[PDB]
Design a protein around this ligand. Structure first.
Ligand SMILES: [K+]
Ligand SMILES: [K+]
Lengths: 307, 307
């Protein structure tokens, strides 16, 4: 009772549609449409609840009914959504995705403007609660002002930051000294550091840069080459990817971030926390949904000790 | 007053997305996504509630949370959704729509399969309630078995039928003798009758065909030419379109159908009911949403006494 994690990020509705018999353009074509809960912050929060952590989501949804049902589904994942800001006169953010029979994304749209409602004033209304969490997880979907507020008011609570995308990660560059753990991929790390990752001989170089700019811990996902982890105190290593039957790649990074934060709270060492996080992402990859409902400590452990 | 109307049709979630700039295929492109309640039956029910009728919707939605929010949103329009079947283990039906800068339809997907959960057994569980309505409105999204059940068990309650599309209207052809009022467009009428509507000289013939196959009343929407109405007892005429600011064409027919049924309940003559229904369609056209929230008897009336 009372150890908890705060997750400040975006909460979305992911709508995935594919036509079943080819695409007759400029015509309604019969197919399959799915509404899944999405958004980096929300997804991470869910994975944290599934990993047995008391998780509070600090996000923004619309005054529309569908946002409130998003909050409801998330709440029945175990997540505490009671502090989520509901914005009047605005609509809940969403990720529209047009795929095909195979499952290859043809085109996609995103309406993530309400992420800007996650304002510094809002988190300031929860300052003390935030400062009494065991760890804070933030995604870079929020504004530069909001992230800056978080990093400036963390009161020595470790902030784990998900850089999200190559475009959205840049807001992190000048504040690496305020981040406990960053989890970029190849493109994000290259974009931040300004150093190309053509070979693995480059990762050290990249890591050095990060450490020179004040980053405490780096968790660099290199996809099939694996994960490179580096601690500013000198510990660094490679973790091979978990052999996984990949059916859907969505939700992988979210599960990884959740694994990292959860393991930090559980007092686990860096390397084994990374392996565990890889196990979480592995569970995410082997699932059709963004969040694998079978994500558990026991099953991730089982998956990991398979190797 | 415990006079009520029953609407048996589909309940959907319409998801409309358009990009702010030019669509870069195979990439997440920033835009705006809107979730509006849709589905011919549901929309008609809503317009009927807005026209001041106690309206009961008999539809099917999924066990997912978004379906329950669809039902809720509909309920706060005044519609009674308490008899709506909620189907376990499946997803609420939906209409995915990819638009562009202007608002021009690029592509569309539809997942309306749960419409066939609206079964004859389900309607049979509400047989007497259905048979005590002042009017039954049915759309052709339901299965032929379901429509057949309705028309066979109406107990002399007038059934107003919305043919929906050229593909789904055909299930009506052999049961025209069981329908009080049919509201087809040009294409639907041509598809049913097997007679082309190239000119105005053809509408009479089309009407004759319909009457010879047992249809009581025909309300033939001809778009810019207007509406041709025909009673099997010999009354027939033309009603010119109400000059309207076409902003969104969606929801026009739903508003028209609702107008027709509502006017029938209010004891209005055929022609004047058609004019009123046209006024409803005018209000629908003047709105960006599928349902104009300002749809009222007073406002439609004001609109119609304008010329
Ligand atoms: K997945
Ligand atoms: K409209």
């Amino acid at each position: 009772e009372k150890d908890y994690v705060v997750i400040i990020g975006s909460a979305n509705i992911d709508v995935a549609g594919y036509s079943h018999e080819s695409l007759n353009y400029a015509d309604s074509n019969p197919g399959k449409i799915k509404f899944t809960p999405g958004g980096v912050g929300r997804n991470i929060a869910q994975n944290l609840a599934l990993l047995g952590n008391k998780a509070w989501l600090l996000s923004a949804v619309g005054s529309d009914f569908y946002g409130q049902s998003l909050l409801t589904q998330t709440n029945q994942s175990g997540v505490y959504v009671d502090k989520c800001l509901i914005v009047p006169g605005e609509n809940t953010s969403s990720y529209l995705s047009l795929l095909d029979n195979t499952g290859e994304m043809l085109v996609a749209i995103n309406d993530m403007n309400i992420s800007n409602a996650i304002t510094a004033e809002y988190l300031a209304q929860h300052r003390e609660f935030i400062q009494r969490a065991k760890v804070i997880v933030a995604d870079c979907n929020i504004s530069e002002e909001a992230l800056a507020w978080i990093l400036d008011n963390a009161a020595n609570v470790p902030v784990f930051v998900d850089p999200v995308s190559a475009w959205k990660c840049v807001k992190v560059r000048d504040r690496l000294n305020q981040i406990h753990t960053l989890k970029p991929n190849r493109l994000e790390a290259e974009t931040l550091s300004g150093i190309a990752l053509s070979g693995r001989d480059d990762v050290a170089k990249v890591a050095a840069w990060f450490h020179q700019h004040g980053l405490n811990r780096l968790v660099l996902s290199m996809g099939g080459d694996g994960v490179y982890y580096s601690d500013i105190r000198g510990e660094n290593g490679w973790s091979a990817p978990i052999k996984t039957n990949v059916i859907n790649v969505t939700g992988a990074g979210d599960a990884m971030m959740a694994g990292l934060a959860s393991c930090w709270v559980d007092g686990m060492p860096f390397a084994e926390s990374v392996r565990f996080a890889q196990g979480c992402s592995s569970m995410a990859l082997s699932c059709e949904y963004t969040n694998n409902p079978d994500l558990s400590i026991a099953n991730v452990i089982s998956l990991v000790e398979n190797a």
